[PDB]
Design a protein around this ligand. Sequence first.
Ligand SMILES: C=C(O[C@H]1C=C[C@H]([C@@](O)(CCC(=O)O)c2sc(CCOP(=O)(O)OP(=O)(O)O)c(C)[n+]2Cc2c[nH]c(C)nc2=N)[C@@H](C(=O)O)[C@@H]1O)C(=O)O
Ligand SMILES: C=C(O[C@H]1C=C[C@H]([C@@](O)(CCC(=O)O)c2sc(CCOP(=O)(O)OP(=O)(O)O)c(C)[n+]2Cc2c[nH]c(C)nc2=N)[C@@H](C(=O)O)[C@@H]1O)C(=O)O
Ligand SMILES: O=C(O)c1cc(O)c2ccccc2c1O
Ligand SMILES: O=C(O)c1cc(O)c2ccccc2c1O
Ligand SMILES: O=C(O)c1cc(O)c2ccccc2c1O
Ligand SMILES: [Mg+2]
Ligand SMILES: [Mg+2]
Lengths: 542, 532, 538
Amino acid sequence: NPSTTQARVVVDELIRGGVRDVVLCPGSRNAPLAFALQDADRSGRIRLHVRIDERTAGYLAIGLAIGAGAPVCVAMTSGTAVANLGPAVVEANYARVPLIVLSANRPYELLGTGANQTMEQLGYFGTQVRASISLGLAEDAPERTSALNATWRSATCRVLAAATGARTANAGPVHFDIPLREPTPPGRPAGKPWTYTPPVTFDQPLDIDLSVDTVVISGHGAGVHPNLAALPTVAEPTAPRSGDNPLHPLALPLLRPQQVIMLGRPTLHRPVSVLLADAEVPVFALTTGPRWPDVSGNSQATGTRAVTTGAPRPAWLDRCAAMNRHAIAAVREQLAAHPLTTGLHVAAAVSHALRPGDQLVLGASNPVRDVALAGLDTRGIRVRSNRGVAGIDGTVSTAIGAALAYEGAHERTGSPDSPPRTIALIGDLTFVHDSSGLLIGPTEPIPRSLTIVVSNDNGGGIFELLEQGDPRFSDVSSRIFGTPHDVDVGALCRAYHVESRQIEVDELGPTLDQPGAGMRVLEVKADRSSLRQLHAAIKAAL
Amino acid sequence: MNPSTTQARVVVDELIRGGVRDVVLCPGSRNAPLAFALQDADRSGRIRLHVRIDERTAGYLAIGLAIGAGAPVCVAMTSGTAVANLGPAVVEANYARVPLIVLSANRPYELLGTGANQTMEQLGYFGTQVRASISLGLAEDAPERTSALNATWRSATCRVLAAATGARTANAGPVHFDIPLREPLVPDPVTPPGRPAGKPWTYTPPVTFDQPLDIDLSVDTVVISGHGAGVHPNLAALPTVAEPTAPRSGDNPLHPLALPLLRPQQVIMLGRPTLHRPVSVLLADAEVPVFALTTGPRWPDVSGNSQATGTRAVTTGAPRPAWLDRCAAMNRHAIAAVREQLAAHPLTTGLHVAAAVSHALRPGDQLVLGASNPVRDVALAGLDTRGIRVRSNRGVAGIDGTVSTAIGAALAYEGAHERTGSDSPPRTIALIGDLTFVHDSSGLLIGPTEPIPRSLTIVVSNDNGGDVSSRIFGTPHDVDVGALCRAYHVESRQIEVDELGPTLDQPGMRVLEVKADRSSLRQLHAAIKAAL
Amino acid sequence: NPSTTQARVVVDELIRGGVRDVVLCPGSRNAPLAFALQDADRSGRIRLHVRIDERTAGYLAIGLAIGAGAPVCVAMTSGTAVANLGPAVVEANYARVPLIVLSANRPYELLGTGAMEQLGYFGTQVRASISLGLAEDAPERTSALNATWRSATCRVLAAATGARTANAGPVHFDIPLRETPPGRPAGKPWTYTPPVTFDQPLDIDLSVDTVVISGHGAGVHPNLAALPTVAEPTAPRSGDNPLHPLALPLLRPQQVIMLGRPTLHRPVSVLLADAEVPVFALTTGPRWPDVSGNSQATGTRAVTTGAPRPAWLDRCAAMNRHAIAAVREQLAAHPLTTGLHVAAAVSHALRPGDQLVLGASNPVRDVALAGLDTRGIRVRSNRGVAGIDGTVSTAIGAALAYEGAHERTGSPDSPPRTIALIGDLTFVHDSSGLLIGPTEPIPRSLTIVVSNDNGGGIFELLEQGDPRFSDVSSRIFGTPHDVDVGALCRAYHVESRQIEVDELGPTLDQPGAGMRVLEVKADRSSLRQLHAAIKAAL
Ligand SMILES: C=C(O[C@H]1C=C[C@H]([C@@](O)(CCC(=O)O)c2sc(CCOP(=O)(O)OP(=O)(O)O)c(C)[n+]2Cc2c[nH]c(C)nc2=N)[C@@H](C(=O)O)[C@@H]1O)C(=O)O
Ligand SMILES: C=C(O[C@H]1C=C[C@H]([C@@](O)(CCC(=O)O)c2sc(CCOP(=O)(O)OP(=O)(O)O)c(C)[n+]2Cc2c[nH]c(C)nc2=N)[C@@H](C(=O)O)[C@@H]1O)C(=O)O
Ligand SMILES: O=C(O)c1cc(O)c2ccccc2c1O
Ligand SMILES: O=C(O)c1cc(O)c2ccccc2c1O
Ligand SMILES: O=C(O)c1cc(O)c2ccccc2c1O
Ligand SMILES: [Mg+2]
Ligand SMILES: [Mg+2]
């Protein structure tokens, strides 16, 4: 049949385009390209992942795409599919993740008259996706076989190109529809894609005088700038570090920089937000994509790289280095002097235990910030986190997807060594949010060396550090911002047959040092009633 | 009073004046103005606040809080994916016509495109699924304009309420109410008043929408009522194949299995029939005329031969007594086959659990059903739904948020009984499959400070399971139901089907797990087909 | 062939649904249902109107619908069709006009890879977006495919005419393409939807000093007929106690009954926004308006108790006569001719049975200021968005539909007059609407009166019209054009005559060509001073 010939053409081109992982979910109707995907899965050409939860499936694809950079597909099958994939698609848009959403519309059926179970469309597709491409019904015309193969494969590489940013340098989600009526022509030789897109280089030089007292702030999506490696740099955990001169985030208010070089999209730390908005401080935004950020409209110029003149003052370097030391010492000393265990303690333990080659997945909220407060040195490490829109949803499956993709890349190198560790640090709310992600059937791929560390302070500790955390709200803030839940984390892990251990913070390093089951949850109970005082103590020790 | 605090207090007040009794709130800092105002209202008894951690299942808790007593319910969340997580519950609320107000905080729109953390294309995210997408607008720091802003804010809130409850449309559904807020978000170290006597700012009397239809009841007629069906006393005598969520209008039941063995000459379709393949087969009969009677402007195109649509029937004649006798005999025969075969069958199936739950119920109970096999099994068991309120997310019939809907339906039902001023609160019994229960197991989660249903029992009919995607159903998931309820601190017990009736008679929230077989399920249904 | 059978079925059901007129334009691809449409037009079941301009073809459909209240179709044909139809569809939404936009997607072709050209407005304007689905080659199931195609067409008409929502408006109807089964007996629609009544009573105390403001889309209320009524031109009248809009600022009503959607008169908005005056909104549809959030309640009809004070009735009637007299006396004293003069002339020349089409800007406002009595007159104006675009074709379509309804009576009398009063910018905006091929239907009694003051007169009466802006406001607000109106109508072969104000009544009394343009030169030099003279006399 032509529909079944079409499916095998697309899947073949998708494999040629670098798609190593595809996610599906049971639904009202068959998945798009399901049979072509099943054939390729048994052949090992591609790895399928099945989940019941459509929401966690979308974030599973996010992890499968950020773990090694490959485009990943998700196959919608139901009417709830658009709604449940929404959060992952929005994140894919903002985090610039190549996420291809597969659909299978039926043009012989009625649209707009009732329950459109193929697609219940929301409004987010019009604003989030890089492209909406539909293949058109497969003609029963064997004379056109040569031509239909060319256009199907050209359109499939179009979907891939839009998803990976091959020509735009702005990866993101793409909607790909392959229509169907109810109820293999070859590609290019040597496994090359039908339409090849060579490496694209968007270039936007900016003149910057480095003799002016400059601090670098690198956030999500930041590039590597070897000509900025010497500068003091306040780097977010997901920012690749260009050099060896880190500036602690808490030292920034103890300095007066005269200009700021902003790499990527920063989302963390109020000292960062205040400095970038300072009208007396020129801010140069260097990005890898067409977008650039601003705080209060204070971005003076945008580019992709810097053409640097001069060099930083040694007196400015030495005083930045000294404040960096003061902030590092205030954290470690006040943490040691603190009686109770907080998430900041847990983050410091997780950070001392990381080894080069590791993959670190950071949940939103306090964990991704605490890891920066503990001064983690990310060099030699791959650090992921859904900074696109900073949700606490889907983090478990993002970690599972990242682990599966990172390990698959390692196995592909053919190295004899153990698959590298994926270690995740997530809050307790974040864990409860995506507990469904732990349920993985026996037929489905499971990570070989993933450890999810759950710092559990029975609620959202980050709100103790905001205006609602001031003691004048202790009357009221417990219920509406603390949100305690009393969840038995161990019992939840037992229900999903996930190896689980509850340990105290001193035991975390040793436990992570010794491998265990392929997937496991380490729970370290923490306190958040002392969190605001602890941060106040660090500020007072600065 | 700073602008965000004033605006949030005006809105919450007008929402309460509009009939909102329950509000679901999920944590965040951008929606802190909404949290503080809703908290005050909860503490003075104006509303009952319910806090949840997962925005998606929290939407289904609000849906349950709406279908339980008929009132509009709002769910408030911070900006970002928290809003996007309400998508599933909005799709269900759209089709099930549920007044669900999605009350989202947002960054100022001026920040959209700047790269601000947790900022996205929020307004219009839901598209055509919501009855309206309304933005309040950023609150101006302008004291002399306070009287004016009070009137615009309150009139905009009543528009949200009117679109949600179908006040003028007769088509209730979800509404997106986006509130852009900026610092200061917390109250700084008197609220502009609404109308006197607690009246809403814009009074909208519930409308009466009327489309009479001429139907001759002499012609051999069968009535098929589905979700959203109305009550039609002039149709009470007719043989009625009623979905469990369709309110009965009389006492002439027609079993769904009996319909294909009869030859009706015309069909009166009440509401939107979803459930049974046999009513689907007859609605595709293009030679049999169908009259569609609905309580709202929408009407099902399930039948290709619907001659006319309306709101009520203007009846002529009366049904042939031979025709009434014939169907009544078909109904007794179909129900006899089901009960005879269930007793002959050796193993306990989900259909046995379903029959046991139906026999246990008494008038005044509220029955919540997972929208898969449980509502299909309870219908085949011949449940008599007269006097009991039956709920089910039949809008899209997804497995998301089923536990949260039962919890929400129970809380709203109990609260309605408490305002009667009466006895112990009425029972709410939920019957859910194991796969659906595990899927929305985190919907069990109720924080210690949060309201707990007083009389909700969740019967889990555990048969360990229900294209390449179906390969996950080749193996029983083997998920510990008891460990799940232990994780969410809910009392759970494993019991046998004949214990079920006595356990339910006993006077918080508990789960009753009933192990069941599904290997013999196909053999049991075939024995029912053969006994017909 | 499946698609031609499907096309005939849909057109047949559309005709059974009361569609009498369909507007098409030559297009890059074939029109949806064009072969089925042509046959129906040849047999006289439906009347086709072809234009080249897609924008004014959309407003031609607007007129063909508001002329007799019937659903009208427009057949998209090209990649600019969606962009050109946008204005009329937005107007069809806010004015609640039964507009069915036909498309024909080709599901065997690629989407999103090259050059229907979608914008963002379809999602926010239409009542429904229904796609019929491709017609399968399956003679076994013809009978079922017939019922499915016809019911879906019934669904499109129900959304367009508001047969169940009481909210007519635009509908997107798609019938897909790849490169006759009968309907119901006695011509009945396949799925019949009887008349629906949305009913929302409101208790109102008529003893409270009440005045009625009725705007676009207002319903007819017998039990409000005695009250003073500041009515808009397009609003039907329930009784005969008119209150001049200029009398409103000199009165203190204690409550206002608001009918429909008022858009005219700054004194009206001031009253409706008055926080000490309760405002009851009575509408025929689900929507309701508010000014400054001061709408106290909404409904469909009033349940009245008590009666207005006779002293209150007398002073309002007195204020009406005083405001009427100030306009007519200041007009007589004014030396130069203005649009207000032209408007007053047009209204005195109107008879019962006439159709009056009012352009936006000053014409629709001036007609109310002249105290036109709209009883017996069908008054049309695009008040939904109040654009100055597409008014020439709206008048043409309104005249054709009005005349077509009269002619179906069979009456021996000549078709009733359709008189349109539009400003000059309005006329230049939709000038291309005058170009009609000899094969296309042309009205027989349309007269387009163009009050030409060589720019936008309404801006003389606003804040930018204050003399302190005299230096700069003429170029950016007056926008003079020096267009030879007579030459342009000559180019399109339209009968046209420039006439003076007192020539208007006599020239409208005797018919001429089926379509003609009566231009009356007018003045905005003195428009502000004229309106100051009227306010001073009040
Ligand atoms: C950091 C600040 O505020 C942020 C602090 C909290 C929330 C936040 O956005 C943080 C996200 C981030 O930037 O990483 C969080 S943390 C947070 C608590 C997480 O608790 P945890 O136990 O997992 O971690 P922790 O207790 O902090 O260790 C919540 C609820 N929320 C709100 C939220 C709601 N729903 C969804 C789907 N995603 C969400 N992010 C944000 C908000 O709600 O507006 C807020 O912008 C600040 O003002 O400086
Ligand atoms: C009436 C007031 O302000 C209005 C003043 C005029 C414009 C208006 O909207 C009025 C339309 C109406 O309500 O009838 C006009 S009058 C107007 C002048 C018409 O001149 P005319 O020669 O046809 O008539 P006139 O000379 O006044 O008799 C123009 C240009 N425009 C703007 C306009 C631009 N483009 C399109 C497609 N449609 C438009 N309506 C409106 C505006 O642009 O904001 C504005 O709402 C007021 O403040 O009371
Ligand atoms: O640099 C990036 O990766 C990046 C990513 C984004 O999603 C942005 C969204 C808005 C504005 C700027 C953005 C940006 O600079
Ligand atoms: O009767 C109802 O309540 C109802 C509700 C709906 O959500 C519908 C959706 C599509 C088609 C028909 C529908 C319908 O008849
Ligand atoms: O009464 C009408 O016809 C009408 C029409 C509209 O387009 C409206 C739009 C917004 C608000 C009220 C509206 C309204 O009352
Ligand atoms: Mg926490
Ligand atoms: Mg003019």
